[PDB]
Structure formats: C-alpha cells, structure tokens
Write a protein that holds these residues in place. Structure first.
Motif, PDB file in Angstrom:
ATOM      1  N   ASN A 141      13.293  -7.082  65.514  1.00  0.00           N
ATOM      2  CA  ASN A 141      14.463  -7.840  65.096  1.00  0.00           C
ATOM      3  C   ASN A 141      14.601  -9.094  65.941  1.00  0.00           C
ATOM      4  O   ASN A 141      14.372  -9.075  67.152  1.00  0.00           O
ATOM      5  N   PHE A 142      14.983 -10.179  65.281  1.00  0.00           N
ATOM      6  CA  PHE A 142      15.415 -11.390  65.953  1.00  0.00           C
ATOM      7  C   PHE A 142      16.784 -11.168  66.582  1.00  0.00           C
ATOM      8  O   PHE A 142      17.464 -10.176  66.314  1.00  0.00           O
ATOM      9  N   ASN A 143      17.182 -12.103  67.436  1.00  0.00           N
ATOM     10  CA  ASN A 143      18.558 -12.115  67.898  1.00  0.00           C
ATOM     11  C   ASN A 143      19.440 -12.762  66.831  1.00  0.00           C
ATOM     12  O   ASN A 143      18.974 -13.188  65.772  1.00  0.00           O
ATOM     13  N   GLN A 144      20.738 -12.845  67.120  1.00  0.00           N
ATOM     14  CA  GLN A 144      21.672 -13.394  66.146  1.00  0.00           C
ATOM     15  C   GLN A 144      21.456 -14.883  65.909  1.00  0.00           C
ATOM     16  O   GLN A 144      22.003 -15.429  64.945  1.00  0.00           O
ATOM     17  N   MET A 177      19.932  -6.793  70.558  1.00  0.00           N
ATOM     18  CA  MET A 177      20.283  -7.715  71.628  1.00  0.00           C
ATOM     19  C   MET A 177      21.391  -8.645  71.163  1.00  0.00           C
ATOM     20  O   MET A 177      21.506  -8.933  69.967  1.00  0.00           O
ATOM     21  N   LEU A 178      22.205  -9.103  72.107  1.00  0.00           N
ATOM     22  CA  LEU A 178      23.254 -10.069  71.833  1.00  0.00           C
ATOM     23  C   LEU A 178      22.679 -11.486  71.928  1.00  0.00           C
ATOM     24  O   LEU A 178      21.463 -11.685  71.993  1.00  0.00           O
ATOM     25  N   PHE A 179      23.560 -12.480  71.939  1.00  0.00           N
ATOM     26  CA  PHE A 179      23.120 -13.864  72.060  1.00  0.00           C
ATOM     27  C   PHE A 179      22.585 -14.102  73.461  1.00  0.00           C
ATOM     28  O   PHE A 179      23.288 -14.653  74.313  1.00  0.00           O
ATOM     29  N   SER A 180      21.328 -13.717  73.691  1.00  0.00           N
ATOM     30  CA  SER A 180      20.742 -13.678  75.036  1.00  0.00           C
ATOM     31  C   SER A 180      21.687 -12.852  75.910  1.00  0.00           C
ATOM     32  O   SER A 180      21.928 -11.678  75.596  1.00  0.00           O
ATOM     33  N   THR A 181      22.227 -13.400  76.994  1.00  0.00           N
ATOM     34  CA  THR A 181      23.258 -12.814  77.850  1.00  0.00           C
ATOM     35  C   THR A 181      22.852 -11.478  78.464  1.00  0.00           C
ATOM     36  O   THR A 181      23.718 -10.804  79.033  1.00  0.00           O
ATOM     37  N   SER A 182      21.587 -11.069  78.366  1.00  0.00           N
ATOM     38  CA  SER A 182      21.084  -9.898  79.086  1.00  0.00           C
ATOM     39  C   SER A 182      21.845  -8.623  78.734  1.00  0.00           C
ATOM     40  O   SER A 182      22.211  -7.842  79.614  1.00  0.00           O
ATOM     41  N   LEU A 183      22.093  -8.394  77.448  1.00  0.00           N
ATOM     42  CA  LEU A 183      22.718  -7.158  76.995  1.00  0.00           C
ATOM     43  C   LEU A 183      21.863  -6.545  75.897  1.00  0.00           C
ATOM     44  O   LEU A 183      21.489  -7.232  74.942  1.00  0.00           O
ATOM     45  N   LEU A 184      21.556  -5.255  76.034  1.00  0.00           N
ATOM     46  CA  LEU A 184      20.649  -4.576  75.120  1.00  0.00           C
ATOM     47  C   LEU A 184      21.217  -3.223  74.726  1.00  0.00           C
ATOM     48  O   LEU A 184      21.912  -2.572  75.508  1.00  0.00           O
TER      49      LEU A 184
END
Lengths: 325, 327, 327, 325
Positions: free
Chosen positions: C8-11, C48-55
């Motif tokens: 999956n891509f990110n948002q 994953m969120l908009f980068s931000t290091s959350l998975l």
C-alpha cells in the motif's frame, strides 16, 4: 535453461564469468566461446583474476558464508575460508584478496593466503566496494554511512592504512568504480542524476556528469582501460557513455523485444577494427576503428555495440550471442 | 518431462526422430502418432532413413563413440560399430552411411555395411555436414578450415565414386550450417555470423543466390530445403524462423513463435508440399479452399508448431495449432 | 525471495509500505530508498500515516486478530489492541483510526487512542472500506449487504459519529471503493467490474459513470489522484485503466510488460505532474513537457514508472522498473 | 503462482476440480467462489462425485500409484489403495468406482470399497476411458487396441460383464465420452477430423461431425446435461459445438492474449438468463436465454461463453475469472 545468479566481467573486460543455479560458466568476448563449465551446484559469486586460471567460488546458500578458491587448470582447490555472515562481494588484484561482509571487510594476501587485516565498517546491505586492479596504486574504497551520508573511506591496501576521506555525495552511495591504473574514482548517488569523478591522490572533484532525467536507479559503473570513457548502467534499459576528456557522450539502446526484468552490466574495451563486409544489412571503407562495448544481461544474452570516437551518438549493435546455451 | 538432446526430421520431412535422456521416440506428421519408443538410456543421435524401419542410435556416453543400427520393426540389431572418439553426426541416403568424428569421416555402404572410404579432414568441433538423399546425385560436403582469409573452404565429395569433385571457397569466416536439396543439385552454407546465406550449384560450383538474414549477426541452428527446392528455411537465436524463396536477398516470409516461448531453444524446421486448407474455418484475411504451404517447427523445449505460408503474399505466417511432444 | 502479502501507498502516494512473510519494509518514491525494515515475522497488514513515523502492523497469524501500533523513529510501541476476530482492513487519517472485522467496524481516536464508536454491520468477507484522509471532510463509507438491495453503501461521518446517507450504488455486491483526498467524491465498482460509478458524498447524486473493459473481470483496487483529476482502476486483465475526472471509455491505459505473470495483484497511484526531458526520451519537440507520473507495484515485487500525457492520453510509455524485494 | 497438475469439472459441470503441485482447490461455476482448498502437496488426479463432499486424491509421485479417498466435510480419510503401476485416470458415479492403469482396469463398489472385477486390457498410454454417470444405465467404455484399431469395449458395470464391441474408427481413438443418461457414446479418431456418436444399446452409428480442417488433435469431448449439444476442445485454441438434433453449430474463440501452451477442457450447462445491464460494452430484452459454456485452461483461467440456441455462430465471452487467486 537453468536460471543464472551472477554475471561479471574480468578486471580487463576481455572475459565473462557467469554463475547459474546449476553451475558456473566462463566465456570470452572477442572470439566468443565457452572456455569452461562445471555442473557442481549453485554458485552465487564467481570472480576471476586476470585469466591465470584462478576463481573465487561462493555458495548460493557451499553456503553463502563459505568462500572457495579453485584452480580450473589443475582442478584442485587452493583454500576454503568461512565467514560469520553471508558473503556480499569479492574483488581481487594481483596482490590482495578482498572479502566483504555486511559489517566487516576481510583482506587477504593473494599469494600466501594469510589474513592481513580486518576493517570494522558501518553496515552495507548492498555489498558495495571498488578496488584498484593495479598493484602499483593498490587502493580500496568502501562507503561509510553514519550509524554526511556519502563518505567513502580510501583504504591503502599496500600499507593497510586509510589515507583520506572524501565527502562524495549528500545522499546514500549507489555505485562506485576505480580505473584500471587506480588513479581515478567514480561515484553515483541513489538519485542517479549526478556522476562525480574524484582523484584518489588529492581528493578533488574532477568531473561531474548529468544522467537519468527521471527516477532510474544506477546499477553499475565501469571505466575503460585507457580511462577515456565511463559507462553507467541503470534500470531504464539504456546505458550512457561519458567521456573524461555535462551531456553524455553516447548511449546504448537495447532492442525492445528483450526481457525487461534484466540487470545489465557493461565494460568498454580497447578500440578495434571491424569488418564492414560481414554486416551488409546494417551499417551499409572495408574496415574502420570502432570502440567495442559489451553489455551482458541477467536474462542470458551478451551484446556488442560499437561507438565512433568522433561522432558518438547512438551506437549500433553488431552481435547478440546467447550465453548459457 | 525428461530433457531432450536431439531432434530431426527424416529425409522426406514426414516423420520425427527424437532422443531423450531416458530413450528415443519416433513420431509422424500428418496423421500424428507415436510409431515407436524405447526407454533404454540416454541417446544423443537418433537418425532415420526414408521410413523403412532403419535407425542409427548413439549413446549419450552405449557410449558416445559406439554406433548401433537397429531395425525397429524386427526389434533386432543389424550391426554394432565402435569408433576411437565420440560421434558428432550421422546421415544416410538409401545408398551410403556416413559417420563423422571431430577429425575423421567414415563412409559405409548401407546394404553391405562394409567400410568403403575414410577421409582425414581438419578438425570440425561443430560436426557439420550435408548429405544428398538421392542416389542419382549422391554428394557429401564437409568444411575444410586451415590447420593452425580462406577459413570457409568446403570440400565437395562424391560418394558414388569416392573421390572429391571440387573445392568451394564458400565464405570468409567459418561455416556454421550446411544443407543439400533433396535431388542433390544445390548446397547452402552459413557463416558463423549468420548474416549472409549463400547457396551454390554443386555441379557447376557457381554461387546462384545470396540471402541477407535479419539485421544483426546471430547464431544459426540449421538450414533445410523444401522437397521441390522452392523455399529454404533457416532458424536462429533470435527466436525467429526465416523462409527464403529459391524460385528466382531479403527473407520472403518470417515465422514468429508465440511470445511465451523460451528464447534459449534449439529450433529446427521443415517445409512440406502445398495442401488444401479451408478458409471457412480459418479467417486468413475468400474462396472456400486455397493452397497453403505447411511448415512444421519443432523446438528443443518439446513443442511442435504448424504454420502456413501464402506463396504469393508471403509475409508473416499464421499459426494453426500446437502439440506437445513427450505427451 | 520471500512471499509478500501486503502492498500500500501512503495517503499521499509518496511512500511505499509492504509486508513479507518474514517482516515488513518501508520505501520512498522520488529519492527511492529503504527508510525502514524489520525482520520479525509474517505481517498481513502494514498501514502508515502521512509519514510521521506511525505504523499499524497486523500479523499473519502477533495474531491476525491482534493490532499493534509502532513508532519507527523511537522504535517503541504505543499500544496493542486485540479483537475477537481477524482484522480485515485498517485505514487512518490524522484524526481517527479505523479497524474492520468481517462483521464489526471499530473507530479509534488516533490521538488519545480511546474507543469512540462501534458499528454492527452485515458480513463483509472482502474487508472493503474507503476513508477520507482529510480532517476537514472526515468521512467513512462501507458496504451494507442484506441479511435488489445488494450494493448499498453506508456513508458514515467520523467527526460526529453518525451516518449521513445511504447510497444505492449498484445492483450486485460492491467490489472496490475509494475516496478522494479532500473527502469530496466516492467511486465504487460491482463484483463484475464492468461499470465504475462516482458519487458525490455531500449530496449522494451520481456524478460520473465509467465503463471498464468489455467482459466482466475482477477489480483489485481503485485510487484517486491527489488533485482528484484522474481515477485509477486495476484488475485481473494485467492492465491498468485511467479515467479522467476533469469532465465512459478510459482516457489512458497502462500495459505491463508481457513477461509479467498474469496472476499478480496490482495497486497504483497517480502523482502530481512534473517536468521530464524529451531530449533523453523520444516520446514521438520542446525540451521539456509536464508528464503525469504513475507508479504501479505488483505482488511479484516490482515497481513500474509510467508517464501520461493529459492531452494525448492513450497508451502510456514506461520509463523504468525496480525490484521491491532485495534492491 | 504454483503450477497446476489436474483440472476437471464434476459429473454435472457445475464445479471445478483443480490440484496443484502444492495442493488442491474446489471451485464453482455460476456463483464463482473457492469452496475448499488444502496446501498438502502435489496432487495428480483430484476427482469429485456429484458434490456430496467426496474426493479421490492421486499423488504427483503420496505416490502416483497410491489412491486415497477423503471426505472434505468431515476432514477424514475413508481408505487408501495402492496399485502396481501409476494411476492414469479415475471416474466415478453414484454406484461404481473405477481406476484405470496402463494395462489394467480396476472396478470398485463406491459404497463398500470392496473389489468387484478386474479387466485385463491391451495397453492404454493415454489413460482413456468413459463412464456413464447415471446408475440407471451404468456402463463403461474403453478402447481395445490390437496387441481393427478403434475397438471400444462396452462394459456393463451393473452385472460385471461386457455387452458388445463396436468398431468405432479405423485409426486410434483419441477421446471418448458418454452422455449423462448413459444412452449415447461419442468418439474421435487420432487425426481428429471426424466425430462419431453411437447408441450404446444397439451400436448403430447415429451422427457424424466434421471438424479440424487441418491437423489439430482432439483432446476432450463432453455432452450437455440434456445431450442436446456436444463440445470438442482441441489444440487449435478453438472449441466447436455440435448439435444432436455435418457442419459445426457454434465455435468458441479464446482471446489471443492467452498463453498458447495450455490444455483446455469444456462443459455445457443448462440454459440460464443473463442481464444485459451488467455488460454495457459487449452484448449491447433485459434478460435472454443463452446456453452457458464454461472453458477452463491449464494456465489458470475460467472462461464463460454464451450461445444463442437459434443463431449459434461465434460465441461471446461474458467473463474471465482467475483460478489460483
């Protein structure tokens, strides 16, 4: 047709070393022919010296950790050395033997087979190095990422001491190569747009070339024997040629019918003369000097292109020989 | 699916011989079927005469040097002959039998089976020959390279009188493939670069036609004439088969195998006599029936491909059907 | 090469998430590189969120029921949530966290992580969802099959936690659904994948209706562009269609190389138009023209880069190709 | 995507039996779905009864000689039987179980599992046999080559005695099939140009069909449920339909993009209604009666075609689903 696992030229570009899932093969370039072959097993790394019947064998996983040195003429084994982790790359010159692991680099004396020095490096998952094949200027380079990203340590194999550190690129290093005489150095970032050439003696940036207008990663870099040309191969099915005398000097376009799931390496040889009578249908003086370029791909095909040293431009294709067959 | 090491048609192109690592098989072409098979061992050379239940069997190494002649109908052994080195090629007509080693040529009478002649030639690691299948013009041609530009010298040898007739300066480079028409009138040669195809008239020696093949140099696997010497078929490493029209340059018609086919496949072909095919079933793009030359292309992966060529239109050829040998 | 189970891509389409049978990986798109990796075990869902290091990591079965959220920069664990049944889908925005089970939907606040709502829905064996990523228009849509009224979709507002309207989308079961970046539009497709319909989530009126392909074939994923200009659909035909929403037939189509295995899952994304050099690429000329980039990743482990001409459209040229496994 | 080794419908044509080198799967036809699957190992023959949760498993080489019968609902094993040679074909009805080997035919009682009769036949390299699926007229037909080539032995499984011998074709028989009611039998010669349909009761030749203008071997023959249509699939990537009410009635053309290195079978179902609104591009009366034809190939795709019972002609393709996924 068993799948192949490893392709590489020799230190001069006049031979082909190839490893299959069933064995290894040793080809030749100008009189294209099958020099040797063995149906022993899977081989992941096959490295050859300047002919001399010397080979480096690494098992696919013989495991990936073990390294075996074999002589093809005597059909005997010189030595076998194991390593804690899987072998990532092997390179040789006439005086030193180098084995690289993910976090360590092993250096051996190619004559006595005794361990000389061990370097503790930051992890290199790509197994990247570049080694000078000439004993006179025997230098080794390897990337040094932080645990300042494109720092490469220039290591003197003669005295076993580093000499200098050059801040090559702002980003992660993708490919490195050293000329035949060990004088120049070439690097490429993971962006694949900038090629920088360094002088090992001083460290100054000598040349900067532009390539890869879009996101095409760079795979391999190679110097010509006279260091007149520098060839870079990427994932775009195109190979560019830069002259070390900005814009690329010449370009190689593989035929479209080829497989796209290919990894191509290249090695520019010394200029030779070609016979125009042999090829009436393409390229039509009986003979003219043309620089040969050899591109072998993982699908199992060897290609021979030629470039006119004055015009440059797109290079014609002479032959397409089928390795592994 | 065992690996196969040898495929060839008979001298008329209406049968198939094949050799696996476990045995040999014999097929048929128009009413397709499996005439014979034995799971004896590895076979490298399986050559057949004009049907007639006569075979030449060479073991994979039954060593590679040994040659055995077997009558499949009688399940008996006509003879057994050994050679000092491995056999590289075997060919027959209804009069003579030829066995080639790397540096020697042995000629046998097919009937009496006694040795007739021996030729000491310069080494031929590729095992290249060409045999005329008709007794009226029984000729054998083999290359004669200089012993270490004139590398592509070929020797025209007459089997009837067992004396060479003439020497043909075929090509500048080494010869890669040779083929003789059914009547023994013409001979076709191919250099190692596969760019120029040359056909010579064997009795006079003059080069009659010269064909350009493809765009760039690539290896050639085999050459074969039509029964009526109308067309010439060459197959190469480009996974493409070309047809050259000898009714008289550029290839007349080209055979493109399906894309899914492996590129590293040895491909041999054959051209048959024109037959009537129904255009109602096949939208050729229309009279109900039109004659179309059938072409059979068997590859080393183990498949047969049937094509048709329009003698006037030529061009890219349509594919009708695909079987699977070994199944 | 380990088997991969999730891509999956990110948002925003500028990153790549992926999960193998041995661990998960995180890539980047423009300066391509491997930002993170972890060799823990089989991972089924990696969001994953908009980068931000959350998975968000869901094990293949870390059982499939258990949900674990991890901050990769700190290498720490925020919390772990267990569920009675296996998780089928997880989607996020910077305000809410949504967990889908086959018959239950759980909604969490991404900040305080406390449970906010729970919806008892009819069974969804395919784990279908579409979630608006912008907090200004935070919407959630999920199918509502009966326990002909088969393609009913429930428009659920996450901000106030109440349904807004019911969309009578299709006659058959819904196969795939997506929401634009700003949360304005919604596109759904039935299990036959022959009709693509676009509804405005604000009012519910059908705005666009697209025909995809000729015969009914399965659809894998639908995705809008960041500017909502184009819509991308991927199916079992090994072909990707792009529908222009600037306003039937697909505007431009993406054909993978013939070598690619036909049994591969493909998800795609469209990026913002950027400048490319026509001097290097013979598009067949101004030195530079803006090409819309499309990134297509297949379940075999390869990435493909295409370029689309907003005026010409048509079949799109392919520039490069990577490998996501190894490097 | 693991390779498959066996693909076949059930006795009614409403299911798909498929066994891979890693396991086996059971599909459906109109409400397409994956009813069952197990990742056990290589399976060579997976044959199913009229649903009823009954299966027969033959190992790829579980060996090929061994035969195992399992029940998928209870996940248990009924029995296991071994044979001196490899198993070539297995067919079932609600009364009898038959296992065919190279030169022997085994007949079993499907209820008790006790052995009933064993037939010594001349070699059958193709593993050819055909069974009537209805217990009312339980027959078995198998070829009888001479050790007079297309002799078919009509064997009555009800009383375990042969009934009559039919001289079907002058050449080798290529494919045989028996209608659902066990009344008719159809055979095709090795040249695959002439179809012959026999009355199994008397042996009279009733119908003769022309097909395969050039040399395209015939692979499979199948009757409809009502025996109104006959479906023949060959190596030409085209499927012909003959009406049992000469020239073919209708033809199936698979899309060209498909792999050509495939083996295709087919089965015709009872007429159904299709919705026009679902398919806007092709095939555009909201609902029409169209006879469904299902073709599955070894590359892993299920194709659905529909034919107009009056016009016939080339048949449209409504869908193409992907097995193994």
């Amino acid at each position: 047709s068993p799948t192949i696992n490893f392709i590489n030229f020799n230190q001069t570009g006049t031979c082909i070393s190839l490893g299959t899932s069933k064995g290894f093969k040793i080809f030749n370039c100008e009189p294209f022919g099958k020099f040797y072959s063995e149906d022993s097993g899977g081989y992941a790394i096959v490295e050859m010296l300047f002919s001399t019947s010397l080979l480096a064998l690494v098992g696919i996983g013989l495991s990936a950790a073990r390294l075996r040195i074999i002589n093809t003429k005597k059909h005997s084994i010189i030595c076998e050395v194991t390593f804690p982790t899987s072998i990532l790359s092997v390179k040789m010159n006439k005086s030193r033997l180098v084995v690289l692991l993910q976090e360590q680099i092993y250096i051996y004396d190619i004559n006595t087979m005794r361990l000389l020095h061990t370097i503790e490096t930051n992890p290199n998952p790509r197994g990247l190095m570049a080694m000078s094949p000439s004993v006179a200027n025997s230098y080794l380079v390897y990337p040094s990422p932080p645990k300042k990203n494109g720092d490469v340590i220039v290591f003197n194999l003669e005295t076993l001491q580093p000499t200098m550190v050059i801040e090559a690129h702002k980003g992660e290093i993708a490919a490195m190569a050293i000329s035949f005489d060990g004088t120049l150095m070439a690097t490429a970032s993971d962006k694949g747009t900038i090629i920088r050439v360094f002088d090992i003696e001083t460290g100054d940036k000598i040349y900067q070339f532009r390539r890869g207008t879009y996101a095409t990663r760079i795979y391999s870099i190679s110097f010509s024997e006279d260091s007149q040309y520098l060839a870079v191969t990427g994932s775009s099915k195109t190979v560019h040629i830069f002259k070390l005398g900005s814009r690329h000097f010449a370009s190689l376009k593989l035929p479209v019918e080829t497989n796209s799931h290919v990894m191509t390496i290249s090695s520019i040889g010394s200029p030779i003369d070609i016979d125009t009578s042999e090829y009436p249908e393409l390229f039509e003086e009986p003979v003219m000097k043309m620089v040969p370029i050899r591109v072998v791909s993982s699908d199992g095909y060897l290609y021979n292109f030629v470039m006119d040293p004055e015009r440059g431009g797109d290079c014609l294709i002479l032959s397409q020989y089928s390795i592994l067959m």
